[PDB]
């Protein structure tokens, strides 16, 4: 932890999906994850350009944007636009979606100064995507390129999401909550890790944090509350690499998965599993019971025997660090393309609680293989 | 006067196809918001490299949701070797349709007894073809002519869902059911009614069935079970027509609303309004109480005092025919644009029921302003 950040970062701010129709994705995600409609920006708020809806659960902010017809905004140019998020662009958005499907366009981090952060990033090698723009003399926004067509976004405050969003009338946004509270890491899939790590730790000063189809490294902020792992494929293997399958169906580099921190992963999983076949997110097939017998041998000090039996009801995977213990599970893909998916996380130990306590689960690749071959022979 | 002039044999509505950016998310939203089962699929998991297509069903109502993959996936596929289950599909036409109109209905699909002859007769009677007949396996034939806008009227026929779909695996298949049972009418908006009603009646032989800013007429098959109303705008000088607003945000003509018949509209509305703000569909703001104080005067012989009470709690609208009575309600738009919406209906009268029983609600245009004036006082 050299604390080598070239500017000051203070946690994730929001994840932005670009969609064909934003109403329907946001309503599916709302119900599937227990997130509340909190802010809107569309025709009803005087936006002729895009429709945008903010979901929030705790500190997690999911935003969903689709474009209107360009005719609607035909008498506007870029400085005269009615758009509340002025880095938007019809042709980029339709291009992004036609190429990659539904997915993440913007990983947005809060920084002390966005203007600064943009200047310091390009001067250390970052490809600019959107210059610094300020909203109603309060919030500043900027975009540099991250990987694929996914930008890293800088929100800064001078002195209720962004200006020109309206707070959502509480008679249409029902208090939903299944326990999700934070974005914990955002991960990207790429063809060559070396080049992507070199470029991205270059313009941020993020440090590196402490096969079965992939190689992976994590980039971290000074306090290690922003975590950005990146994977590449390992080819020729017995099975074909899931990383490789992503890149094919995504047409290149992109955001693989988002990991959401739960203040009670068992509450979250129950609520989510309850709604899988009625509009929410399905889950990966749960591991065999041999994986859970082996659990007492590796985490029996951390989890009681009943809690282990409740992991097994829910299909939870468990891995352990030098510092803490990780509880994790993975959804099936969120969209039509086998590309992006969600992972639900609770961390245990390392006490605020440090970021990364428990790792990221890599030990669970090997573990499963073993547990599935022990099961298939008895 | 039902002149029974169908230029070919027509059974009932078969399904509706939406074209979307992401099939998965639309279908799960609609399933939950409407009470429809996940019952069939065609996608990568079943060998379709071209499009994803998911099918929700409630009774005889079938909603299909379809989106395109990256073309890279099927680049060495020609039409004879296609893994597409719906051969009229076309990456360009979908992506084009969707950026011009957003989320919307591409295919109103009626089931015929022979689709090759339905297509031929239609095209021999003014129908502009969109897809000439393709034979799937050797069980089902499909053909598409132009309807209005980029919406096609699709002909399905059977010798005895579609080949290449699989049944949904029970675990993923939740038997949801809020009471909806079939599609009752399908309505388009066009800028000129006259050309559109001539074109469509010309190649079908459908017959006519018999201001607030719109003009419309209704085409129907011989038994009047397929119903096709069409609205045009009445442009004037007092208010901007709502039909014109549709045309602008849709970028021209398309399908305005689907009318979904419930076997028990009170139950359906109950379950839909429970889910409105947790993933489902909102509804248009409800009429003023003066509208419901006036209900017993007009249908006090059809609905009990208790059942009028339940209309008002659910915000339902009532209209009366020369022959029957109609319960109806309208959602807000299904997607980002102020274009397509859904209407839930149930008809009472005309005893098997005969189609269009009770009309289509035109009485409620003046019934509503009449109540808006009274509520003020
Ligand atoms: C992605 C992932 C991570 C993960 O978090 C990640 C990082 O955070 C940085 C370190 C490197 C890395 O791998 C950790 C464990 C993991 C997966 C995983 O992916 N799958 C398969 C899997 C297939 C298909 C879908 C879908 N849809 C989801 C997961 C299977 C599995 O057994 N385990 C245990
Ligand atoms: C469309 C429609 C029909 C309808 O079904 C139809 C046919 O079946 C064929 C004959 C003519 C026709 O109009 C019947 C009644 C009706 C509407 C209607 O549309 N709206 C406004 C309305 C605005 C915005 C939205 C939205 N979003 C939905 C409805 C308002 C209203 O008071 N009433 C009473
Ligand atoms: Co992870
Ligand atoms: Co109607």
UniProtKB/Swiss-Prot annotation, chain A:
Pathway(s) the chain acts in: Amino-acid degradation; L-phenylalanine degradation; acetoacetate and fumarate from L-phenylalanine: step 3/6; Cofactor biosynthesis; prenylquinone biosynthesis
Top-level taxon of the source organism: Eukaryota
Gene name for this UniProt entry: HPD
EC number: 1.13.11.27
GO molecular function, one term: 4-hydroxyphenylpyruvate dioxygenase activity
Cofactor: Fe cation
Keyword match Cytoplasm: yes
Keywords of this entry: Cytoplasm, Dioxygenase, Iron, Metal-binding, Oxidoreductase, Phenylalanine catabolism, Repeat, Tyrosine catabolism
Originating organism: Arabidopsis thaliana (Mouse-ear cress)
Name of the protein in question: 4-hydroxyphenylpyruvate dioxygenase
Quaternary structure, from the entry: Homodimer.
Cofactor note: Binds 1 Fe cation per subunit.
The keyword Cytoplasm appears for this protein: yes
Domain VOC, chain residue ranges per copy: 11-157, 182-332
Sequence positions that bind Fe cation: 185, 257, 343
GO cellular component assignments: cytoplasm
Function: Catalyzes the conversion of 4-hydroxyphenylpyruvic acid to homogentisic acid, one of the steps in tyrosine catabolism.
Catalytic activity: 3-(4-hydroxyphenyl)pyruvate + O2 = homogentisate + CO2
Enzyme superclass (EC): oxidoreductase
GO biological process: L-phenylalanine catabolic process; tyrosine catabolic process
Matches recorded under PANTHER family: 4-HYDROXYPHENYLPYRUVATE DIOXYGENASE
């Amino acid at each position: 932890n050299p604390k080598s950040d070239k500017f000051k970062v203070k946690r994730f701010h929001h994840i932005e999906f670009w969609c064909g129709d934003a109403t329907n994705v946001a309503r599916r995600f709302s119900w599937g994850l227990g997130m509340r409609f909190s802010a809107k920006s569309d025709l009803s708020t005087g936006n002729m350009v895009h429709a945008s809806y903010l979901l929030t659960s705790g500190d997690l902010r999911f935003l969903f944007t689709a474009p209107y017809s360009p005719s609607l905004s035909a008498g506007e140019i870029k400085p005269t636009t009615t758009a509340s998020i002025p880095s938007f662009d019809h042709g980029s958005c339709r291009s992004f979606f036609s190429s990659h499907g539904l997915g993440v366009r913007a990983v947005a981090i809060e920084v002390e100064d966005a203007e600064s952060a943009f200047s310091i990033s390009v001067a250390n090698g970052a490809i600019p995507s959107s210059p610094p723009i300020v909203l109603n003399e309060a919030v500043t926004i900027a975009e540099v390129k991250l990987y694929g067509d996914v930008v890293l976004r800088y929100v800064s405050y001078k002195a209720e999401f962004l200006p020109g969003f309206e707070r959502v009338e509480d008679a249409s946004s029902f208090p939903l909550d299944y326990g999700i509270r934070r974005l914990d890491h955002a991960v990207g899939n790429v063809p060559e890790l070396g080049p992507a790590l070199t470029y991205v730790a270059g313009f941020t000063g993020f440090h590196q944090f402490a096969e079965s189809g992939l190689n992976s490294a994590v980039l971290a902020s000074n306090d290690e509350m922003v975590l950005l792992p990146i994977n590449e494929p390992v080819h020729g293997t017995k099975r074909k690499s899931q990383i490789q399958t992503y890149l094919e169906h995504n047409e290149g580099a992109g955001l693989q998965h988002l990991a959401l921190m739960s203040e009670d992963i068992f509450r979250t999983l129950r609520e989510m599993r309850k709604r899988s076949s009625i509009g929410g997110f399905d889950f990966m097939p749960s591991p065999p019971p041999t994986y859970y017998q082996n659990l007492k041998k590796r985490v029996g000090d951390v989890l009681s025997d009943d809690q282990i039996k409740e992991c097994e009801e829910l299909g939870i995977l468990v891995d352990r660090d030098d510092q803490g213990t990780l509880l994790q599970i993975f959804t099936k893909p969120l969209g039509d393309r086998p590309t992006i998916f969600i992972e639900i996380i609770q961390r245990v130990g390392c006490m605020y609680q440090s970021g990364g306590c428990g790792g990221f689960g890599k030990g669970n690749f090997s573990e499963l293989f073993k547990s599935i071959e022990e099961y298939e022979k008895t």
